[PDB]
């Protein structure tokens, strides 16, 4: 939410940078301050001065990617889920880690099978109204965000049906995250 | 650097610790023989730590200890077989070769088997500081000529009589193939109870671990024996021979025949058969073919030879087997003449 | 090679054009890379990468230029062939290319120039199609060939060709002459023999090639009457056999020219010899023969496992066969 | 750098692309109907319209007006299609890639279904490059791929491309483009361009575009680049090395004159300018063809050697058919064999030599 | 759509020709002369496979072992449905590994779980690595008395001789335009889809004995169109005319025509149709004529009635002429590349034949 | 049901078992029985020599339970063990995964281990030529200074991929091709003893048909048998030989030379009927002509392996003068370039052949 309205600039930082920056935050350092320049930006954190030339070119869209009607609210605990999810993947598809979900309403249900025999099953809870979300996605992606999600009530806004599910912190909206289903 | 002939390897081996006993030569029988003699006497000489480690064309190098006082968990000198690159040690190699020369080569008693080095390698510093301590053992093969001699001494390796009548026939037919000839004498010795060579006996069973050279055919051709040469080839087939070889070798002789035919039709036969080459025995066959083979009729033949060569070699037509039947008679022109459409 | 003066005007247009973005960022310079294209190319990058600054300069100054001079210009690439090959592989390509999707990395435009695009590979080339066609930002691509023939068409669909013939023979000779002593006939004989390309013309006088040219020339004059060609095996038997094979051809051809009445020769480095060919040989067979000289020249290059010699020899005999009657005398076709 | 036209000349509708109606129609037609294959094979010359028919189709599938004969211009999906980014659509150059590796990965992502698209449409071009394995791997999903997924194959050549692949595509063979189809389209194009076109050059280019609209278009960009503005004849005739001269017949004649020198000295200078041999060759050949034709009928020709028609005629009749065939033949073989010569200049000399030796 | 796939065979019914191979299969299925190994080689039109599923389904049912043209029980049905257990289909994709072969070797050990025999089935084997070939020498050499390996190798050439010495070879061969034509009609009658025998012929002709391919072509006709299989769509998207055109011209050349020939020259140039198609077309006919010279035999399937033009031509045209021309033509073909143009080239080669006509060449002065 | 499967035995499973390949078998036992055995050896030779069948016999006499005998020992179960892997002292250690340097290191940590049954460690390493350069440093270690107990028994069918050092290092025995009679006889008695019906001629056919390999002989019997209802029937073997073979050029050569009209076409049609490449068929014809043309410039032309067909080649040759041979040859050669622009090579060929007619 914070920031300024103060101009954004093509500040497309790489992959690496963001890491050190991220590093330059933690509570620690000074607060992170930015001169967002297209040019470069000039970041202030630690005894450093971290500065990129920026790759200048667009950064692909990010509003569309939100599910089509992410709306069923799958208020779960990010953690529990993150656990359950972790377990389920094992005898889920072992390739893409594409767990398939059939979140029983208000509960949850998950049915995973690793093609290669086996199957994993969970029963968890998600305050989820609206009929089974019946969407599977790459659990490999997911957990990542659960965990980058410091928020532990994460409401998912899905459109129940093998379509994108937005997950956001339920608790704020900061972290809003979208992954996409697997196969059709 | 001292060149030694394998049979005299003991001279330098024994007398003193030669650093790099460099068995450059190529007769495998000779190389093998020069290798094991150093080793044997090396292993005996407290260098039992004996390892083989090639020197790739690759920079290679590994055990470059040559003194460091690292051991006393397993102290001793060791010895290091280097199989050389194609032409010998290259850079990196040369380098780390020149290092060893520089040091006690302690624990790295050099045994460099290989081949003849390249010149620049031999002028390359490493091959400069080995000198005077190393031993080059020429492991190069007999001429046709020295071949019987050798062969004859070599008989007594097997102690069996051998027959020099046979020796020759071995020297020709195994002209230049010491190793297999050595094994030749072995298979048959076993095969009989007696295992005594002599020519009659070596006819009855012939070592099927030792080749019947192109010569038989081509020479048969020299003569003009346009059937003889042909038969040897029926055999050269069942035998599976790569045609390349036959071509190669045939090419060798025939181009030699051209050139000698240019100068021969006015220069006594066979002198030139050895003023160049053309074995002794061939020389006759060969002095003939110049007279038989008049350089002109000879031209079209080359044109077919080339033809086949290309058929093979660019085209990988494996019908060169049939192309030759033409050529035999195209070249020979029969034992007489009988030159015909090319193929 | 080196930058020669005759690379400049090409450059200017191109940079002009480039600067005007009329000049397409692509570019193809026919001219031998032997007749200067490389330096010309790189002269361009020199500028182009530093963003094209000044109207047209090779850039002596510029950070781009100098960092490109240091080469450390990341923008900068030299993009030679791959060395695990010797042709400019796909991979080589894949890289530099993809680095340009990260924009400029130290500014100025990039210039990513192939040294001799003549030297590209196919996975490389195929790879390069889309990049040479499609313009990435600040990219000025610069390619070099012996001749345009050094490249594929689909590529050239998009090559903004900036032709560049050899400079004229005269100049190509004067240019050639400066640097190799031996008569302008040898310069020219050679130059001419080079399809008039200098860069190409020059090489001849190096080595014992042009001396062997002569050498060869001599043995042959003996060969020809004598019907011993076989003498020539060596004169032409060489790593430059094809070249020596080439030395020879241009004379055979000169003899057929005499066979069409034609003073004109491409080896003006001796006309006597030329005459005698025609002289001892009917054109039919001269002509037949001329074919084959190259053909061997080809074969020496084409046949796997081919005895250079074997081939050099067969030929002599066979010539020798032709000089001879009855021995049917071709003319080349079917 | 600096922009091209070729692309910029790529369709939005069937018209932008000249020809292949069988395909245009085949396309308009497919599209409109449920005759949407998730396997298409556009096989035509590089941007003849192998790539153009693909574009139309794309917009039409991811026409946000469904599947439509024409791609219903604008649709977001349609207009972004020819712009960067467009999730439904994922396009590919299998050129840079040769690896199978590249081929494997590709099959995996079809799963992820857009969070808003309507056919995850796949466009492979330059597939030929890819290795065998790369090829064979595609058969699997050409047959039954997951839904939305498509396989618009465009190929220059479906030849480095197995039977089974073709067996498993709609192959809309885009046939080639008539010089005129080209000239025209160009003529149309260039003129739209501010810079004065240049007919001569238009033709110079029309024939020169090599049946591919893309190049055609390319040429042009390039002609401007080095003509620094404006298409003019000369810059293009020269640019093209093209001899708008009758030197073809000149030499033919001088061969016939038994004239050695004239024929030869002329080529050599031409070689200092490196002048195109072929151009020169094709022409000679043609004349001969016609002349003989002029023998057949000095009318039933569909000859365009009219300026010299009389010359043709003249030749045609005076020289027996036979010999005409024969001239024609000699040089045809020499042309064949021209390149073979290590100066280029050398190969043509041979051709003519042999002609000149024929007379 | 994939009518190529869809229409594939599955019963003995769906196997055209190779009745000998069916008869044999039926037969060897009756008296136990079944050997472990079978080896189907042949075209991708009949499918190497189809005939295998038929064998398979004939090797095990759930009604014992009897030859069966069609599914029964499950086993057979399955088998053909690509559902049977002992089925174990052997193919390739990006797959070209050893590991694949291994498994097969392993089930040999096993006795059929549902089958009366284990019923493995390869398609074509030639994409796999060197190893897997040899791996089979072993198991093949000595196989269980309850595991059947039904090999298929389009070419038995791929397969080693020791195992091949042992194999019951069956070869599938190519299918006629007529049979194909006969077919496509039938199939297009099942999925009633318009066609015209000429379009069918044009198609049936273009297919390359691969019904599967004949079906690929029919597919892009239907799509080039909107489901039609008219001659234009077909002839255009195919780039091919009809023999008559040529024939009419040929009748023109023989007859030395220069205008007629010029005409049909242009006729061709006008249909946005190919120049050597013609050349080709012409050499074929020459030959046919010439065939018809010797026996009242050998005439086309794109002529059901221009037989007479042929008979005729065979009769009236001295053999000599027929060779000259076929020849003049053939050279056209080869040289056509260096031609300054295919049409000219085409034009010029006919000028040649005629300039050289063994009737008379062009006006010769 | 594969019925009988004889392509597993009747390669040398005993020192005497197979009556072809004696060249090796004889010196093998004189060496072995006697103590004059080497540390290391080499086997080679074409398949069906029982390539391996030899190495295994060597280990048995080392490891027999009748000492070091080359004497058969069947009551010696060592001996039986040895013929299988079962013998501890026989290691059938292969070579197809012993090709990295580490694969071989291990085998040498086991050259510190004595014959636990036999009297030689016999490491039977077969088909060797697959090893990396590094692997080849390390095997030589136990040769150069040799550990006797281990015997390394090497089989290959490519002795070239093993360095001169190693070769010089090893004693090589070379196994040859089996001849018509070798095979025939081996079978004749073996099947005579195996209670198997051998219609003699089937042998000679099969014997003739494949010479070089004993193994082959039995694989072919296996099909012959399946087709012969358990029997090596001449019917079976001719049948089998027909499956795998068709000659359409000899017949064609005859028909085209005779100027038979429709036999040529008939044949061309048959040649299409049971397909044959038209190009290959051209070439198949070409070669026949040459063969006759050579039978006329040398009976030697027909090599000894050609005895089988000499009679007809001879006779074709002699019914035809060679000029006409080179005339048709000329025609064929030309035909051969027609196939490509030939609208069909069958036609191309038929067209070609209809030209041969005119020269009869």
Author numbering:
A (entry chain G): 183 to 366
B (entry chain A): 1 to 343
C (entry chain E): 1 to 334
D (entry chain D): 2 to 360
E (entry chain C): 4 to 368
F (entry chain B): 1 to 360
Any passages from the paper?
Clamp loaders are pentameric ATPases that place circular sliding clamps onto DNA, where they function in DNA replication and genome integrity. Because the sliding clamp is a closed ring in solution, it needs to be opened and placed onto DNA by a separate ATPase complex called the clamp loader. All clamp loaders are pentameric ATPases of the AAA + family (ATPases associated with various cellular activities). Here we describe a series of structures of the E. coli clamp loader in the process of placing the clamp onto a p/t-junction.
In the presence of ATPγS, we obtained an ∼8 Å resolution reconstruction of the clamp loader bound to a closed clamp. Despite the modest resolution of the reconstruction, we can unambiguously identify the location and orientation of all the protein domains of both the clamp loader and sliding clamp. We observe that the γ-complex contacts the sliding clamp primarily through the A, D, and E subunits; the B and C subunits make minimal contact with the surface of the clamp. Furthermore, the AAA+ modules of the B and C subunits make minimal contact with each other. As inter-subunit contacts are necessary to hydrolyze ATP, this separation between subunits likely inhibits ATPase activity. Because the clamp is closed in this state, we attribute this conformation as the initial-binding complex. The Initial-Binding state contains ATPγS, all other states contain ADP·BeFx. Despite the low resolution of the structure, we unambiguously observe that the γ-complex initially binds to a closed ß-clamp. The existence of a closed binding complex was predicted based on rapid kinetics studies which showed that clamp binding occurs before clamp opening. The γ-complex binds the ß-clamp using the A, D, and E subunits, and with the A-gate of the γ-complex open.
